[PDB]
Design a binder for these strands. Structure first.
Ligand SMILES: [Mg+2]
Ligand SMILES: [Mg+2]
Ligand code: NA
Length: 323
DNA sequence: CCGACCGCGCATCAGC
DNA sequence: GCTGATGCGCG
DNA sequence: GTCGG
């Protein structure tokens, strides 16, 4: 109902993040954008909006101007500025953040041609992000997420029938399209107690590469792989776009905290974690522990709901965590 | 007013 | 090489 | 930029 407002604020949040490098302003706009996005009425005024938490005086003024004119002067100016525009653009390349973006514009590299021209000034992650720049902009229809899932789950079962591979992220929240693919991996040999087998993640990355599902690698350690994959296409069929894929190997006994984390959303995780802090707990992808203001021992978790119970939240299905 | 704003993996660099 | 700080990315 | 104390 409030698409224009939420777009406005998301553009503002991006600006603060990419250009101003004021992350708290970025988070302020993102929170507001999210609370408004779920408000079940068409906002008639900035006062009506200010009743929501996250919407304050400043954002209320914004919403009133946008409502009046259909525009924000602040944004129309930001759009008109070259340094800001270029910086904001460059940041869309995976691996180029606000700092790299600003250094690049400093050197006179500010367009997509410039980047291609200057690949030797790019690190690996950056080169692959430029390579698949167009692809990584596309969303993934759920139907393709379903094929991708089959592949990953079937291949992993071939490396060792004891791996458990769970697709998380937006896919798990039931989205009709996903920004990418997110795979939580567990193997019984790897727990909080011990790592009984080396290269648990490697063998999996290896296998998925062997069958040409994984095509590139952005980053890779003992527990986190961040890379690129592609569905196989039929005879004469145009190739599918290349897609980002993240794989996270998590202690088997810490699954429920792991799957909570990877299911998100990102904003939901930030809100859940902040609420946990007020309630007197700290939540990460491994454990929830009680808080001198210093973290205690891991409390026993047997489901995602047990985590919710701790911080006195009613349970929310994954499909309701898309904040 | 003002402090506080999650939590963490991997790549890179400085500095030793 | 190592440690630690910083950039970037994940949700 | 917002908000809680
Ligand atoms: Mg995702
Ligand atoms: Mg994401
Ligand atoms: Na991802």
């Amino acid at each position: 109902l409030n698409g224009g407002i939420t777009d406005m604020l998301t553009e503002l949040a991006n600006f603060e993040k990419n250009v101003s490098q004021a992350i708290h302003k970025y988070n302020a706009y993102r929170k507001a954008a999210s609370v408004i996005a779920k408000y079940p009425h068409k906002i008639k005024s900035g006062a009506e909006a200010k009743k929501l938490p996250g919407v304050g005086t400043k954002i209320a003024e914004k919403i009133d101007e946008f409502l009046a004119t259909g525009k924000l002067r602040k944004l129309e100016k930001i759009r008109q500025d070259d340094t800001s525009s270029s910086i904001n653009f460059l940041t869309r390349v995976s691996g180029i953040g606000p700092s790299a973006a600003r250094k690049f514009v400093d050197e006179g590299i500010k367009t997509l041609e410039d980047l291609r021209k200057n690949e030797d000034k790019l690190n690996h992650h950056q080169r692959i992000g430029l390579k698949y720049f167009g692809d990584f902009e596309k969303r993934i229809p759920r139907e393709e997420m379903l094929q991708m899932q089959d592949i990953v789950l079937n291949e992993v079962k071939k490396v060792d029938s004891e791996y458990i591979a769970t697709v998380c992220g937006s896919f798990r929240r039931g989205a009709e399209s996903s920004g990418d693919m997110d795979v939580l991996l567990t193997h019984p040999s790897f727990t909080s107690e011990s790592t009984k087998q080396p290269k648990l993640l490697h063998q999996v990355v290896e296998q998925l590469q062997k069958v040409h599902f994984i095509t590139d690698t952005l980053s890779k350690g003992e527990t986190k792989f961040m890379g690129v994959c592609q569905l196989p296409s039929k005879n004469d069929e145009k190739e599918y776009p290349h897609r980002r894929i993240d794989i996270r190997l998590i202690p088997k006994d810490q699954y429920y905290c792991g799957v909570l984390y990877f299911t998100g959303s990102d904003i939901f995780n930030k809100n859940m974690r902040a609420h946990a802090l007020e309630k007197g707990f700290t939540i990460n992808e491994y454990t929830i522990r009680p808080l001198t203001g210093v973290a205690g021992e891991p409390l026993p978790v047997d489901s995602e709901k047990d985590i919710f119970d701790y911080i006195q939240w009613k349970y929310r299905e994954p499909k309701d965590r898309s904040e």
